[PDB]
Write a protein that binds this ligand. Structure first.
Ligand SMILES: Nc1ncnc2[nH]cnc12
Ligand SMILES: [Cl-]
Length: 259
């Protein structure tokens, strides 16, 4: 299979929203990623064209060919953060910190252009050949600030183990604290190789245990006290008391020099 000058050479992803292909230009040998949708997409493309940052997947352009749309994007040949997390272990704290720094730089960037991602998780955090983190997949992304005016969200979306509790409990909620929460669950996964709860509900025992500060349980007992103090500020049930990214950047562990 092929599109104009490009050959589609191998599958990088095959989900609900189409397939992602490695695309190699037959002439130039340039490798890119191509998202293939058999036709919502108007919006995603509008958002993709806004994106210009070292920790966000760049958009190159699109081609309609009948019922098939082709979205051309920066390739991340390093795979996903998901593949760097050892189950039950996590990864070395200095690698976690570096990835967390890059993830915060990407999320500040998106929030600064009034975009919320809404599905931050290790599968959506891709690595380039230098292990640089790229926030990918803008199929659920939306505008939360336009003409300097914030709009609250009401659509429930994301992935239950990563979603903030307000998204299950409130009719409308602020976008930014939901993305901050999901970054906290990503940091837990990196440092513990395990997700803390199926979902942040009153009916979820592991969530109740965290609210009662039972940090002698897993996954918290595998996490050093410094990163764990940051996770205490991020995974705060009240989204107005939750730490903001400006304040994450003043955290002791965030600024701790590591191996
Ligand atoms: N799934 C993916 N794999 C590699 N690079 C990509 N760029 C966008 N999506 C990608
Ligand atoms: Cl995990």
């Amino acid at each position: 299979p092929f599109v104009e000058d490009w050959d589609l050479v191998q599958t990088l992803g095959e989900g609900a929203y189409g397939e992602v292909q490695l695309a190699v230009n037959r002439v130039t040998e340039e490798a890119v990623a191509v998202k293939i949708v058999d036709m919502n997409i108007k919006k995603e493309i509008c958002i993709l064209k806004m994106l210009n940052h070292e920790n966000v997947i760049k958009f190159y352009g699109h081609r309609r060919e009948g019922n098939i749309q082709y979205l051309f994007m920066e390739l991340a040949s390093g795979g996903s953060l998901f593949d760097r997390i050892e189950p039950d272990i996590g990864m070395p704290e200095p690698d976690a910190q570096r990835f967390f720094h890059q993830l915060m730089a990407g999320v500040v960037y998106l929030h600064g252009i009034g975009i919320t991602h809404r599905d931050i998780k290790p599968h959506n955090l891709l690595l380039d050949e230098r292990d640089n983190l790229k926030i990918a997949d803008y199929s659920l992304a939306t505008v939360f600030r336009y003409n300097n005016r914030e709009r609250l969200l009401n659509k429930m979306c994301g992935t239950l183990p990563y979603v903030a509790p307000e998204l299950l409990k409130r009719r409308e909620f602020h976008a930014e604290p939901v993305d901050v929460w999901s970054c906290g669950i990503v940091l837990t996964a990196m440092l513990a190789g395990e997700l803390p709860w199926d979902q942040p509900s009153d009916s979820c025992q592991e969530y109740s245990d965290w609210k009662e500060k039972k940090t002698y349980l897993n996954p918290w007992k595998k996490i050093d006290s410094a990163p764990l103090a940051l996770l205490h500020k991020i995974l705060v049930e009240n989204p107005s008391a939750r730490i903001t990214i400006p304040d994450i950047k003043k955290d002791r562990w965030y600024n701790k020099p590591l191996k």
